[PDB]
Amino acid sequence: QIEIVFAAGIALFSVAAAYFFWAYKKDFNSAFLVSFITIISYILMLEGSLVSAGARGGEVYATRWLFYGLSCSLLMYEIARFLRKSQSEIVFLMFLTVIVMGTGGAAAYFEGWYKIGFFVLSSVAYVLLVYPLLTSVSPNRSAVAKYILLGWTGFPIAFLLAPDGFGIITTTTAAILYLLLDIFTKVIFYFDLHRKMEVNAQKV
Amino acid sequence: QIEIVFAAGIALFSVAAAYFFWAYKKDFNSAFLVSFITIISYILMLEGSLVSAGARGGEVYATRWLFYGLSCSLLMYEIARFLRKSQSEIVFLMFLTVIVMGTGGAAAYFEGWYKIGFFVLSSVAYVLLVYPLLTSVSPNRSAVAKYILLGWTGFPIAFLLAPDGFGIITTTTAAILYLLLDIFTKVIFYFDLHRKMEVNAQKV
Amino acid sequence: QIEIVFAAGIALFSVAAAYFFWAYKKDFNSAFLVSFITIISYILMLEGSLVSAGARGGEVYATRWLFYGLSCSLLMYEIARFLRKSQSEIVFLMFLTVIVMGTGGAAAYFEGWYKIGFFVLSSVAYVLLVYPLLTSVSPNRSAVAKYILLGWTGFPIAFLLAPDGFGIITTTTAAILYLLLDIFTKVIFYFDLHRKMEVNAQKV
Ligand SMILES: *C\C=C(C)/C=C/C=C(C)/C=C/C1=C(C)CCCC1(C)C
Ligand SMILES: *C\C=C(C)/C=C/C=C(C)/C=C/C1=C(C)CCCC1(C)C
Ligand SMILES: *C\C=C(C)/C=C/C=C(C)/C=C/C1=C(C)CCCC1(C)C
Ligand SMILES: CCCCCCCC/C=C\CCCCCCCC(=O)O
Ligand SMILES: CCCCCCCC/C=C\CCCCCCCC(=O)O
Ligand SMILES: CCCCCCCC/C=C\CCCCCCCC(=O)O
Ligand SMILES: CCCCCCCC/C=C\CCCCCCCC(=O)O
Ligand SMILES: CCCCCCCC/C=C\CCCCCCCC(=O)O
Ligand SMILES: CCCCCCCC/C=C\CCCCCCCC(=O)O
Ligand SMILES: CCCCCCCC/C=C\CCCCCCCC(=O)O
Ligand SMILES: CCCCCCCC/C=C\CCCCCCCC(=O)O
Ligand SMILES: CCCCCCCC/C=C\CCCCCCCC(=O)O
Known part of the structure; x- marks a missing residue:
């Protein structure tokens, strides 16, 4: 059942990475990197070795949140630059992003008062x-x-x-x-x- | 017994992170990040899943040293900048800092000639x-x-x-x-x- | 048998790191860092705890590929700078380098269609x-x-x-x-x- 969802994710982001690579300038392409990392993450979830038990008889794939630490740092970089945050503020927000995802994976994996x-x-x-x-x-x-x-x-x-x-x-x-x-x-x-x-980054 | 020490650590650095966030400029706040990471590290040590046996019937919490790779890199950044090291020297010393902590966690975890x-x-x-x-x-x-x-x-x-x-x-x-x-x-x-x-960083 | 190969690696890169540190300028020394990281990697492979079964009754030391994510990022930095790539292109190629090594370790560790x-x-x-x-x-x-x-x-x-x-x-x-x-x-x-x-980096 859930295998179909993960395979859908692999296929969609494989197509997305291919489109983003060819359609955009051959330089730092964050859209390609974000999609490529997400493929890696969905294949690992499909492989199934890093599942853990979750609430009410469910399952948890906590490596999803660890991978977001990387892919969402790239997105926060784009977002903060788009808002013309200073460089030191861009770094700060990328750090908070890694912290959010890293502790979130810990929250998903652990139990009880540690989850909370x-x-x-x-x-x-x-x-x-x-x-x-x-x-x-x-x-x-x-x-x-x-x-x-x-x-x-x-x-x-x-x-x-x-x-x-x-x-x-x-x-x-x-x-x-x-x-x-x-x-x-x-x-x-x-x-x-x-x-x-893209137009914004060329002006700063 | 040791749970009391870890909980003391969680509480102190929760208060420290809160003070550092509010008291300092809303920009790159390394003092807040260092303290926030240390909370994460103390909660993981309190949870107790990553303990290993140590010398003379003791225990080792090797994730402490891995987390220092991140938090001490932030401290080395501040220290080297305070000493007006060049940018390439600041990077070099941050790399050495990660290497020190990473191999130190390995030293704590392994045994015999590998510890040495x-x-x-x-x-x-x-x-x-x-x-x-x-x-x-x-x-x-x-x-x-x-x-x-x-x-x-x-x-x-x-x-x-x-x-x-x-x-x-x-x-x-x-x-x-x-x-x-x-x-x-x-x-x-x-x-x-x-x-x-802070005054030093504003002049360079 | 294979222990002799790993010990050869530890010894050679210990000598290499020592030569690179003393012979080159006391600043960002990527040659020293690349060699020092490789020592760490060979000691971990020698210790033998992270071996896994490989094809045809062989063994896999997948932490080799994870460590290349760090050491080869330093090499790609030098290579791209030597070719006078732009800064944003240098970053992009360092990201691809981490992706190559990270998925390569996954390929080595997993099996079947996941290896492929x-x-x-x-x-x-x-x-x-x-x-x-x-x-x-x-x-x-x-x-x-x-x-x-x-x-x-x-x-x-x-x-x-x-x-x-x-x-x-x-x-x-x-x-x-x-x-x-x-x-x-x-x-x-x-x-x-x-x-x-070195001469090239001084001109850019
Ligand atoms: C895949 C792309 C993105 C932008 C994912 C973003 C994820 C979050 C903002 C998740 C935040 C969490 C919070 C705030 C607290 C509990 C754990 C979460 C990681 C789900
Ligand atoms: C928590 C903040 C700091 C600044 C911690 C610093 C830790 C060290 C300098 C530890 C160094 C080690 C050495 C030099 C060799 C054996 C292993 C250690 C990691 C304890
Ligand atoms: C130790 C130094 C270097 C430069 C190692 C480089 C390694 C590679 C270029 C390996 C590439 C791989 C590919 C392209 C696909 C399968 C998995 C490998 C990691 C072996
Ligand atoms: C050509 C431009 C770059 C294209 C972006 C990436 C394209 C993706 C390419 C190959 C994806 C391989 C998918 C892995 C299949 C896993 C199936 C399984 O493990 O069961
Ligand atoms: C615990 C979570 C594990 C994942 C770790 C993720 C850490 C990576 C963080 C940031 C990557 C750096 C992105 C830099 C973009 C700069 C782009 C540019 O300069 O053009
Ligand atoms: C920047 C701060 C980063 C903090 C990182 C926190 C570490 C995350 C904790 C746990 C996630 C590990 C996921 C476990 C995989 C499943 C294991 C299993 O198969 O039982
Ligand atoms: C408001 C400004 C920012 C404040 C800094 C961080 C404040 C800390 C907040 C909450 C800490 C939660 C502590 C976790 C308790 C763990 C107890 C347990 O697991 O048994
Ligand atoms: C094996 C150890 C694991 C932990 C990995 C830690 C790696 C993180 C290293 C450095 C973080 C970068 C800090 C940059 C501070 C710059 C501040 C600024 O530009 O204002
Ligand atoms: C920059 C170089 C970084 C080198 C990283 C070295 C890896 C550290 C080695 C071992 C630390 C792992 C801690 C084990 C947690 C306890 C496991 C258990 O419960 O048995
Ligand atoms: C003095 C300039 C810097 C020199 C570079 C590094 C030198 C290497 C020094 C010590 C290497 C220790 C080797 C570890 C031996 C492991 C043997 C074993 O675990 O069986
Ligand atoms: C999954 C693979 C795990 C290993 C993670 C490796 C990530 C580290 C990446 C890049 C390190 C940054 C190198 C910067 C060199 C800059 C030199 C300079 O500015 O003089
Ligand atoms: C930037 C993307 C990085 C992707 C990281 C991919 C994670 C690599 C996956 C598996 C490698 C783990 C090696 C396992 C060590 C041996 C374990 C054992 O003793 O059974």
Whole structure:
């Protein structure tokens, strides 16, 4: 069952990486790297060796969150640059991004008060991560808010519902939802904003 | 017993991270990041899944040294910048710092000639790490020597005594000593030097 | 048997790191770092805890490929700078380098269609990695082609033959071949090019 979801993820991001490589300039291509890393992550989840038991008889694939530490750092780089954050602020927000994903994987893997403790830690770093973005004085703020509020913030809600958290929804339901969020935050994100982000980076 | 030490560490660095975030400029805040990472590390040590047997019936929490690879890289960044090292020298010293901590975790985890071999490797990198700092022509050298000599260099001595090394002192004694060294090198360090380091970074 | 090969590797790169540290400028010394990391990697392979079964009754030491993610990123930095790639292109190629090694370790460790899938992924990233180098308009291109074609590209061929891939050659034969390739790409590389690369970096 869930194998079909993972294979869908492998196929979609293989096509996405191929399109992003050929369609964009042969230089630093973050859209290609984000998609290529996501393929690696979906193959490892499909292989099935790093599953763990989750809430209410579900399963957890905690390497998903560890891989987001890399792929979402690339996305935060693009987002913060698009909002013309300073260099030292871009670095800071990339660090918070790694911290959010790393503690989130820990929250998914561990149990009891440790799940709760890690989830809280991750949530604090996350609030500190998105406050400077959502209150940015950049005119690009609105174009960026929709991915932060709908996509990025969709993940902790999904997590709480999934076997990663309380286990209200099944492992396959969570995985489909994670894949939709992945497509929105990693593929649509670039279809939508690639042109504006590219023009912006050339002016700074 | 040792749970009380780890919980003390979680509480102290939670308070420290909160103070450093609010008291300092809302930009790249290394003092906040160093403390936040240390919380993560103490929670993982408290959870207890990554303990291993150490010398003389003691225990080893080798993930402490792996986490120092990240948090101490941030500290070395501040220290080398404070001494006005060049950019390429700052990078070099951050690499040596990761190497020291990474091989140190290996030394703590493994046994026999491998403990000795990794300890030596870590000690060589460490000598190369601190020689340019202790012989710096910067007038900030003295302000920096005390953390290097008393705090940073306290760790390999503690390690040799602890179950990580020969096991002369118990796991709880080592942990208390590691926590004191942590407080000195990560919290007092900033109480002491934050102002001078901040003024210095604004001039370069 | 294979212990002798690993100990040869530890000894050679210990001597190489010592020569590179003393002979070159006391600044960012990538030749020293590459060799020092390779020592760490050979000691871990000698210790023997992270072996896995490979093809035709052979063994796989997959941490070799994970460590190349770090040491080869340093080499790609030098190579791309020597070819006067832009900064954003240098970063891109270092990312591809980590991806090649990381998926390569996965390919070595896993089995069946997962070995094949990861090997292909690694091979695609690798083609994208070396195409901008082999078609560079730099006059340094030829001096660089020989390490890419003979050394870097030697590894996937060796991998396919080794127990990492089809298991046509024994684990000890593969290890000797990996060590020769290591010496060529990490030690001869600098004996050959250190002067030209150093003079080049001073002009950019
Ligand atoms: C795949 C792409 C993205 C942008 C994924 C982003 C994921 C998050 C923002 C997840 C955040 C979490 C929080 C805030 C707290 C619990 C654990 C999570 C990792 C799900
Ligand atoms: C938590 C903050 C700091 C600054 C910790 C620093 C740790 C060291 C300098 C440890 C060094 C080691 C050496 C030199 C050799 C044996 C293994 C150790 C990691 C303890
Ligand atoms: C130790 C130094 C170097 C430069 C090692 C380089 C290794 C490679 C270029 C290996 C590439 C691989 C490919 C392309 C595909 C299968 C897995 C490998 C990692 C062997
Ligand atoms: C050509 C431009 C770059 C294209 C981007 C990446 C393209 C993806 C290529 C190959 C993907 C291999 C997929 C692995 C299949 C795994 C199946 C399995 O393990 O069961
Ligand atoms: C615990 C989580 C594990 C994953 C680790 C991820 C760490 C990688 C972090 C950041 C990668 C650096 C991205 C730099 C983009 C710069 C682009 C440019 O300069 O053009
Ligand atoms: C920057 C701070 C990074 C913090 C990293 C936190 C480490 C994450 C903790 C646990 C995730 C490991 C996933 C386990 C894989 C499944 C294992 C199994 O098969 O039982
Ligand atoms: C508000 C500014 C930022 C504050 C810095 C971080 C504050 C720490 C917040 C929550 C810490 C959660 C502690 C986890 C408890 C673990 C207990 C257990 O696992 O038994
Ligand atoms: C094996 C050890 C595992 C831990 C890995 C740690 C690697 C992280 C290293 C360095 C982080 C980069 C810090 C950059 C600070 C720059 C600050 C600024 O530019 O304002
Ligand atoms: C930059 C070079 C970095 C080198 C990294 C060296 C790897 C460190 C080796 C071992 C540390 C792993 C800690 C083991 C956790 C406990 C496992 C257990 O529960 O038995
Ligand atoms: C002095 C300049 C720097 C020199 C570079 C590094 C020199 C290497 C030094 C010590 C290497 C220790 C080798 C470890 C032996 C392992 C043997 C074993 O584990 O069986
Ligand atoms: C999965 C593979 C694990 C290994 C991770 C390796 C990641 C490290 C990557 C790059 C290190 C950065 C090198 C920077 C060199 C800059 C030199 C300079 O500025 O003078
Ligand atoms: C940048 C993308 C990086 C991707 C990282 C891929 C993770 C590599 C996967 C597996 C390698 C782990 C090696 C296992 C050690 C031997 C374990 C054993 O003793 O059974």
